[PDB]
Ligand binder design. Structure first.
Ligand SMILES: COc1ccc(C(SC[C@H](N)C(=O)O)(c2ccccc2)c2ccccc2)cc1
Ligand SMILES: Nc1ncnc2c1ncn2[C@@H]1O[C@H](COP(=O)(O)OP(=O)(O)O)[C@@H](O)[C@H]1O
Ligand SMILES: [Mg+2]
Ligand code: NA
Length: 331
């Protein structure tokens, strides 16, 4: 009923990456939705969208997210994940960065990414939509098949959580004791994101290469109530999972491995999908051949230094376009 959407975002050259050649190793054509990689031999790939090195945060938000936010408001469950090599900009894409000197408010920070922009817009849209709504958020991270809660205000970050099958959703799990924070208005957004980032820093001191090996799952749930013309009360639940995956180059890698095998199983129509075999694929079962509208943002480098991982990423992402989901609205 609906293919997983796959898009590619190339970042600029970083301070490490040498460009020797007059014509780009990696060419992005947003109009033709093509990425072309000089391995004079060039492999070309078509995707649903393509964003070259110059693409700004606001452009990614407008092109990818705005349409997905509308699906969320219709009561679809939606998932956007960032996939790619460490250093290519998964976190830059999904979260962004904070500009220094407080030269900008968080709402106008041009380095801000999907999560802060999305949260701001939810309030803008639903307030002048007139509708009765509440928003709650959670931030869960997975490292070494263990579950870290970054929004719990009270506990040590080293107090890890447990997962169990949802009696109310054949393809879902409940994270027991996961902190779910009600965001009453947009002026409560920043302090939440701040607490999440700070607590992550604490996690990074406890675990080897935490940034690059961890998966980050930021969940926003919107309860919306509507009156029908026949005078009945309609409750819709829209859900957005914004997922920043472990670096593609990587028990430490069980979740990333199993995601691989799950994707392979779905595209090759093999009959057993091993969702159950890692924490990430249990949490995202529904995003991967289930009842969710899913997008992948594949992040890549333009540089010869990182060409092999860039090629693996493109091939991995490109195959995922064949995954068929069956989107359904929550009333
Ligand atoms: C989990 O989601 C987050 C958390 C933190 C931020 C974020 S950027 C976080 C950055 N990616 C990081 O890894 O620490 C922020 C930074 C510093 C303090 C508070 C927030 C930010 C929010 C709005 C605008 C610009 C930057 C953005 C998203
Ligand atoms: N689209 C981009 N434009 C400019 N700088 C970027 C972009 N994407 C990533 N960067 C920079 O590249 C570095 C790595 O980004 P990061 O988000 O940590 O990547 P990842 O999470 O994939 O490892 C950071 O300095 C970041 O600010
Ligand atoms: Mg990252
Ligand atoms: Na343990």
């Amino acid at each position: 009923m609906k293919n997983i959407q796959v898009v590619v975002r190339c970042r600029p050259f970083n301070l490490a990456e040498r460009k020797a050649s007059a014509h780009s190793i990696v060419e992005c054509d947003p109009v033709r939705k093509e990425v072309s990689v000089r391995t004079s031999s060039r492999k070309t790939y078509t995707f649903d969208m393509v964003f070259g090195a110059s693409t700004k945060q606001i452009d990614v938000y407008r092109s990818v997210v705005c349409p997905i936010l509308d699906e969320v408001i219709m009561g679809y469950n939606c998932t956007i994940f960032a996939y790619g090599q460490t250093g290519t900009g998964k976190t830059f894409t999904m979260e962004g960065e904070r500009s220094p000197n407080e030269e900008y408010t968080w709402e106008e920070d041009p380095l801000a990414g999907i999560i802060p922009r999305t949260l701001h817009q939810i309030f803008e849209k639903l307030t002048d939509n007139g509708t009765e709504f509440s928003v709650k958020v959670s931030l869960l991270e997975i490292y070494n098949e263990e579950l870290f809660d970054l929004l719990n205000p009270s506990s040590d970050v080293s107090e890890r959580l447990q997962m169990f099958d949802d009696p109310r959703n054949k393809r879902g799990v409940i994270i027991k004791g996961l902190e779910e924070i009600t965001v009453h208005n947009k002026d409560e957004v920043y302090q939440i994101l701040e607490k999440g980032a700070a607590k992550r820093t604490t996690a990074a001191t406890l675990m080897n290469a935490y940034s690059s090996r961890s998966h980050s799952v930021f969940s926003v749930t919107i309860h919306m109530k509507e009156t029908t013309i026949d005078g009945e009360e309609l409750v819709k639940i829209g859900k957005l999972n914004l997922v920043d995956l472990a670096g593609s180059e990587n028990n430490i890698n069980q979740s990333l491995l199993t995601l691989g095998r799950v994707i392979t199983a779905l595209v090759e129509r093999t009959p057993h999908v091993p969702y159950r075999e890692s924490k990430l694929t249990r949490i995202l079962q529904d995003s991967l051949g289930g009842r969710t509208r899913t997008s992948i943002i594949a992040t890549i480098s333009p540089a010869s230094l990182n060409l092999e991982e860039t090629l693996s990423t493109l091939e991995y992402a490109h195959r995922a376009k064949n995954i068929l989901n069956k989107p359904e609205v929550n009333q």
